[PDB]
Design a protein around this ligand. Structure first.
Ligand SMILES: *[C@@H]1O[C@H](CO)[C@@H](O[C@@H]2O[C@H](CO)[C@@H](O)[C@H](O)[C@H]2NC(C)=O)[C@H](O)[C@H]1NC(C)=O
Ligand SMILES: *[C@@H]1O[C@H](CO)[C@@H](O[C@@H]2O[C@H](CO)[C@@H](O)[C@H](O)[C@H]2NC(C)=O)[C@H](O)[C@H]1NC(C)=O
Ligand SMILES: *[C@@H]1O[C@H](CO)[C@@H](O[C@@H]2O[C@H](CO)[C@@H](O)[C@H](O)[C@H]2NC(C)=O)[C@H](O)[C@H]1NC(C)=O
Ligand SMILES: *[C@@H]1O[C@H](CO)[C@@H](O[C@@H]2O[C@H](CO)[C@@H](O)[C@H](O)[C@H]2NC(C)=O)[C@H](O)[C@H]1NC(C)=O
Ligand SMILES: *[C@@H]1O[C@H](CO)[C@@H](O[C@@H]2O[C@H](CO)[C@@H](O)[C@H](O)[C@H]2NC(C)=O)[C@H](O)[C@H]1NC(C)=O
Ligand SMILES: *[C@@H]1O[C@H](CO)[C@@H](O[C@@H]2O[C@H](CO)[C@@H](O)[C@H](O)[C@H]2NC(C)=O)[C@H](O)[C@H]1NC(C)=O
Ligand SMILES: CC(=O)N[C@@H]1[C@@H](O)[C@@H](O)[C@@H](CO)O[C@@H]1O
Ligand SMILES: OC[C@H]1O[C@H](O)[C@H](O)[C@@H](O)[C@H]1O
Ligand SMILES: [Cl-]
Ligand SMILES: [Cl-]
Ligand SMILES: [Cl-]
Ligand SMILES: [Cl-]
Ligand SMILES: [Cl-]
Ligand SMILES: [Cl-]
Ligand SMILES: [Cl-]
Ligand SMILES: [Cl-]
Ligand SMILES: [Cl-]
Ligand SMILES: [Cl-]
Ligand SMILES: [Cl-]
Ligand SMILES: [Cl-]
Ligand code: NA
Ligand code: NA
Ligand code: NA
Ligand code: NA
Ligand code: NA
Ligand code: NA
Lengths: 94, 94, 94, 94, 94, 94
């Protein structure tokens, strides 16, 4: 019979930048082992955050170039925002 | 034999407001197709955030009215907070 | 045949502290019923957040002591950060 | 994702007739608990057989009235055949 | 997590030959739709049989050339055996 | 969520004896690798059979001592029955 089920993989990525401010952006190659059967959906959020109040809080994250074999874990702030630390979390399921 | 398995669905919703401030709240209908066999659990977070530092950071998100066919993706700030941009992320599994 | 499937459990934990500031840290024991077959991965993020702008934003969360039977849902801010309210979200899949 | 899986149930039914000849036919109600999600297919054969050589060997079996709740395990010989003992086997899968 | 599951397909094939003896052998192509993910095992037996006592009972059956797409349902008697009617049953699982 | 699925294993076992009569009984250790998670059901039938017509046809088969690790594939004729060749088939599903 036909049933709908998912396989999920998940992970975190910690960036301890301070005493230096974090790079404006980061892109990390993540690999699924073994590859998924179907191209999975992937979402990303923040597990930890250390942002300076001297300017607005601007943070962004996403999963780019998602394939059955992996994806690019992306982060970026912009303009005058100063980020001191952060931890991205992500989950991918087909 | 009896085994525990999950089907998962996930998605994101971007709100680009600036030059205008984002509305105090938003409620968006999300449909699952096909419907889940069981009422899934759903959780919501933020994938992107642009908040003004001139006041406290107040953000809230939730999955309301969750059924096998979908749910209401909810967001709200409150009091004096000013939000310029945000992206919600959500995942539903049974 | 051999296939990859996941079982997922998820939940949220709300802390309203206002007008008192939330404790610097929190640790909540979470149970998985029934226990997982394999030790799951767990990720944690924020569903709601209320942080004072008088100081930098510093929030941290994680799943600690993860077993098939459960885990410790952990939160903490640090230094001078003042947090007024927060809601943690978590998802665990094997 | 969509996958093909089967749930299977199976069983045997022994008929010790000797010293009397087995009835020309038999029909036994079989129940699946719990019921299947989809009507299963069912096949039936012989695990044991004791047939007289004074006439031709004529045996027949089938799964009749198959529903998600169960089916009728059917057996019959015909004409001049004499059967002294027999055991039916069956398996149902969706 | 990794788990062992099977998909099964099954079927029957009736050969009514009387008043003529059945052919010494038969080979029928069986198609699996959709094809299995992995090459399944297949076993074959007799659900009905009508054999003349004037000679020894000799019957044979098997699943030949098994692939994910199908196989050849084979039957044969040999030597002096005379078969009047028979029904084959088969089940394929991966 | 909870679903019913089976894992199945199957196999055949050929005994060529002619021109000598096959033994009155046979018992073969069958191993499931890897073991099942739950004690499976097992049914056994005949895929090939060669019985002398000088006496009644008497054949018997079963799966004895079934565990998650394996079982004893049993066969026996009785009294004056002469069996020349036979092939057992079996399928085990949990
Ligand atoms: C957050 O990161 C995503 C991923 O890189 C950015 O997405 C790009 O957005 C531009 C328009 O702003 C599109 O033209 C590109 O196609 C997107 N690239 C990818 C890889 O999808 C997004 O702009 C970022 N958001 C902010 C505010 O920094
Ligand atoms: C975040 O949004 C949720 C959902 O809109 C709000 O939840 C309500 O909480 C009150 C108690 O404070 C309950 O009595 C209601 O039943 C909840 N509504 C729903 C639909 O569940 C929550 O109050 C909001 N948080 C903030 C800080 O605005
Ligand atoms: C975020 O919380 C995690 C988990 O509570 C903290 O991890 C600890 O880090 C220290 C050293 O930094 C280790 O000695 C501990 O063993 C870690 N605990 C666990 C259970 O992993 C992490 O330091 C916290 N981050 C911040 C900025 O507070
Ligand atoms: C074997 O048993 C099956 C099931 O009772 C018999 O099938 C019936 O066959 C007749 C024609 O011979 C049909 O009219 C009926 O519709 C069939 N019944 C069902 C439930 O399918 C079959 O005839 C038997 N074979 C022998 C040789 O006895
Ligand atoms: C039953 O049919 C099968 C399939 O046609 C026969 O299998 C062959 O058996 C010989 C002798 O053991 C092997 O060398 C061949 O490789 C087999 N061929 C196939 C297609 O597997 C089997 O011999 C038949 N049994 C009888 C008694 O007729
Ligand atoms: C068929 O084989 C089974 C299993 O080997 C035999 O079952 C035995 O039956 C006797 C008498 O009824 C019992 O004392 C034993 O305890 C049974 N053993 C098992 C494993 O259950 C059965 O007798 C055989 N049938 C024929 C006709 O030979
Ligand atoms: C009425 C109202 O919204 N009050 C809010 C309170 O809920 C809390 O957010 C506090 C600290 O930021 O700021 C205000 O007092
Ligand atoms: O066995 C051969 C032949 O014997 C009788 O004639 C039966 O009526 C037929 O159906 C067939 O079984
Ligand atoms: Cl840390
Ligand atoms: Cl700014
Ligand atoms: Cl954006
Ligand atoms: Cl404020
Ligand atoms: Cl709340
Ligand atoms: Cl500060
Ligand atoms: Cl018996
Ligand atoms: Cl006859
Ligand atoms: Cl028929
Ligand atoms: Cl002969
Ligand atoms: Cl052979
Ligand atoms: Cl006899
Ligand atoms: Na960095
Ligand atoms: Na808006
Ligand atoms: Na608190
Ligand atoms: Na009877
Ligand atoms: Na024929
Ligand atoms: Na032997």
């Amino acid at each position: 019979r036909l049933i709908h089920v998912s396989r999920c993989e998940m992970g975190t990525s910690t960036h301890r930048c301070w005493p230096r401010p974090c790079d404006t952006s980061s892109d990390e190659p993540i690999s699924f082992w073994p590859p998924f059967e179907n191209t999975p959906n992937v979402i990303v959020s923040f597990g930890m955050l250390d942002v300076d109040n001297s300017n607005n809080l601007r943070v962004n994250s996403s999963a780019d170039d998602v394939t059955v074999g992996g994806f690019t874990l992306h982060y970026n702030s912009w303009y005058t925002t100063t980020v001191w630390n952060y931890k991205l979390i992500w989950i991918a399921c087909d």
